[PDB]
C-alpha cells in the first residue's frame, strides 16, 4: 500500500543512514585492531542499500548484466534495444537506482546539517524524506512493485 511504504521508510532510512555512517569511517589502508562483531525486515533493507553511494552506476552496471541476462539481447533487434536503454539513463522517471540516490541525499542531509546545525538532525530529516517520497509518487511507485523488499 502507498500508506505502508510511507511508514516503512522510517526504519529503512534510519537503517540506511546508520550503515552509511559505519562505512564512511572505514579504514584507509590496513585496519587498526577491531573488536569481534559478537534486525527486522525493513531494518535489513537499509543495510543492503547501504553500500554503493556515489557509484550508483555499480547498481546500473549490475543492472546491465542482469538486464542483458533477462531479455538476452542479440544482433537482430539490437539497435532498437540499445538506444532504448541508453535513453533510459537520461529520461524523466523513477527507477530503483534513483530511489537509492534519494536515500543517499538524505544521508548527506542528516549528516552535513548536524555539523552546521543547532541540533541533531535525524528526526527532522525522515520528515523531509517521507513528505517528499509520498508527494512525488515515489511511495506509490515503490508500493506497486511489492514494497521496499525489492
Amino acid at each position: 500500500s502507498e500508506e505502508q511504504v510511507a511508514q516503512d521508510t522510517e526504519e529503512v532510512f534510519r537503517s540506511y543512514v546508520f550503515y552509511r555512517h559505519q562505512q564512511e569511517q572505514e579504514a584507509e589502508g590496513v585496519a587498526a585492531p577491531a573488536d569481534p562483531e559478537m534486525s527486522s525486515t525493513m531494518g535489513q533493507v537499509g543495510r543492503q542499500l547501504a553500500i554503493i553511494g556515489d557509484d550508483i552506476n555499480r547498481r546500473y552496471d549490475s543492472e546491465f548484466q542482469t538486464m542483458l541476462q533477462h531479455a538476452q539481447p542479440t544482433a537482430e533487434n539490437a539497435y532498437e534495444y540499445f538506444t532504448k536503454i541508453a535513453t533510459s539513463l537520461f529520461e524523466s522517471g523513477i527507477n530503483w537506482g534513483r530511489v537509492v540516490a534519494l536515500l543517499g541525499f538524505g544521508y548527506r542531509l542528516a549528516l552535513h546539517v548536524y555539523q552546521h546545525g543547532l541540533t541533531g538532525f535525524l528526526g527532522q530529516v525522515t520528515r523531509f524524506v517521507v513528505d517528499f517520497m509520498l508527494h512525488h509518487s515515489i511511495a506509490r511507485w515503490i508500493a506497486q512493485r511489492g514494497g521496499w523488499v525489492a
Partner: protein, 122 residues
C-alpha cells in the same frame, strides 16, 4: 578539549627483567579509538611495537616482541599499558604513545616519549 597523551613508565632495567609502561590520555573518548606503542631505537630507526583494539579484545604485535611484550588498556582510567617482559639489550629505546586516527593505521596525536634502557653496566 585538547588531546594529550602522557607516558610515565620509563626506567633503567637489567636484561631479562620486566617493566610495565603506562600512558594516560585526555581530550577524547578513550574507549572509542585504538591505541599503539612506537619505539625509537638508537640504530634500528622507528618501530611499531603493538596496537590494541578500542575495547582491548584484539591485539597486534610485531614479531620481535611477540611473546614478551603485552599491550593492555583500562578504559575506565583512560590508560593503556605496555608490559615488557624478558627485556633484551635491543629493547632499549624511547617508547612513544600513539593514537590511531580512527579505524585506520596512522596516528592522530603522539606522546612525548619515555626512555627505557636495558643494560647491566659499562
Amino acid at each position: 578539549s585538547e588531546v594529550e597523551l602522557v607516558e610515565s613508565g620509563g626506567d633503567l632495567v637489567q636484561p631479562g627483567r620486566s617493566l610495565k609502561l603506562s600512558c594516560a590520555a585526555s581530550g577524547f573518548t578513550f574507549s572509542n579509538l585504538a591505541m599503539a606503542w612506537v619505539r625509537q631505537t638508537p640504530t634500528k630507526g622507528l618501530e611499531w611495537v603493538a596496537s590494541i583494539s578500542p575495547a582491548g579484545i584484539t591485539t597486534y604485535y610485531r614479531d620481535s616482541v611477540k611473546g614478551r611484550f603485552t599491550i593492555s588498556r583500562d578504559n575506565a582510567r583512560n590508560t593503556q599499558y605496555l608490559q615488557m617482559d624478558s627485556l633484551r639489550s635491543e629493547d632499549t629505546a624511547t617508547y612513544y604513545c600513539a593514537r590511531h586516527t580512527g579505524k585506520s593505521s596512522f596516528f592522530d596525536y603522539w606522546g612525548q616519549g619515555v626512555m627505557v634502557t636495558v643494560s647491566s653496566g659499562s
